[PDB]
């Protein structure tokens, strides 16, 4: 009955948030979502969406005719120009999406690290990293204690004696 974090593992059970906490104590196992980190990621992603939704005010009209074909020379110049421009936008579209996706994925990983680093800094000297994205807490942490970590009210000074004693001895 072991639990593991993000270092190689997603949580298909986490369904009310993007990032979250999963703990196990004497009271049992539990999973909660972190609001702040989840919303930050959603805000940045929707920020990209709004940015790509921005319509253009440039209006274009007909320059050739698909009923009565225009003269050959000017017609071929037109087709050559259109196809050239189509190549450009097709390239831009391909590149834009590819570039955005690389960043969307990276900033998502970044938020995960920030959350992990926040929790590490909270626990101070009362816990050790297990290398799977989890912290081994070297003191008794009931549900209320675990909840104190999620809402950033964990006072490490309270458990420092008990923890450092278990880490060393």
């Amino acid at each position: 009955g072991a639990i593991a974090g993000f270092i190689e593992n997603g949580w298909e059970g986490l369904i009310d948030g993007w990032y979250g906490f999963r703990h196990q104590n004497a009271q049992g196992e539990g999973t909660a979502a972190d609001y702040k980190s989840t919303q930050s990621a959603i805000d940045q992603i929707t920020g990209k969406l709004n940015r790509l939704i921005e319509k253009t005010n440039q209006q274009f009209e007909l320059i050739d005719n698909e009923f009565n074909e225009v003269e050959k020379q000017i017609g071929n110049v037109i087709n050559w120009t259109r196809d050239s421009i189509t190549e450009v936008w097709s390239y831009n579209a391909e590149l834009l999406v590819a570039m955005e996706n690389q960043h969307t994925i990276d900033l998502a990983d970044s938020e995960m690290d920030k959350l992990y680093e926040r929790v590490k800094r909270q626990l101070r000297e009362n816990a050790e990293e297990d290398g799977t994205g989890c912290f081994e807490i070297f003191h008794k942490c009931d549900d209320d204690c675990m909840a104190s970590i999620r809402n950033n009210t964990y006072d490490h000074s309270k458990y420092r004696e008990e923890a450092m004693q278990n880490r060393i001895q």
Binding site: E12, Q58, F60, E61, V70, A93, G133
Partner: protein, 318 residues
Amino acid sequence: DKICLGHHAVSNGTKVNTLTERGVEVVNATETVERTNIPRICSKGKRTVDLGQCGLLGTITGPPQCDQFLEFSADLIIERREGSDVCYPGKFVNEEALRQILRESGGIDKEAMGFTYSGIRTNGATSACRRSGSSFYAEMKWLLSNTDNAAFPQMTKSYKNTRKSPALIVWGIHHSVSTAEQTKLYGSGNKLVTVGSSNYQQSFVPSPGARPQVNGLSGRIDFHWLMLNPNDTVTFSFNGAFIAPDRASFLRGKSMGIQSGVQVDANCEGDCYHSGGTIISNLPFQNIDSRAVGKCPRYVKQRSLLLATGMKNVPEIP
């Protein structure tokens, strides 16, 4: 006691592309390239004319098919393939340039040019332009000699644009099937038509000769046009084979013209059109038609470009 940090994941992953990977699964993605087309012309909010059989250039000269469009007005102008600019066989010179002008004219206002004629006939009509009986272009006058083989007097009619906008002036040169028919209509001798403005000097001559019968006729009436600057004047010197105008045209304002083969819809509201319908989309790109007009997303070759709207999808270790 132990607390673990994690992120969500699904078994319903969708593949996208990055700079490095191709087919990397993310939690959630959305499409950027529109392919969903509305096979109608969304005309809600815009005054729309479905010219149908009336060719756009026909609205100026006025064949029977365009009688209801002689002074039309619109925000959106629709050309149909079955449309025709002519009744009596012929074509415009600089036709496409003129079309592009009328597509954004907002319609046309016609004004009498006030030409009067002396020792000739003006009742030139034909079976090709039927209107109850044999007739002619509603805005033009087919001039003849008076009896048959009779001499056509030299003339010189002029018209001044007394308005603050340029006037669209159109006239025609008739090309008879034979010099025999040209003589029968306007009398013997070499005919000449000269058109003079203050930045226009073109000259014209009939080219009688045998041609394939269009609608039973081998004759050709080909139209020419110029824009008359405000306060400027045009002058028509001629001795036959001349299709004179009765009215000039003035552009109403602003519009957009399209070519289409699908029905009009007055309840949907669009701004990007193609021959196959209307593209209504907030997506930045589209893969429907490269020649789409109005305010449209950019056209691209690709049918699909997925934008990641979620993190990388990493399956839970079972």
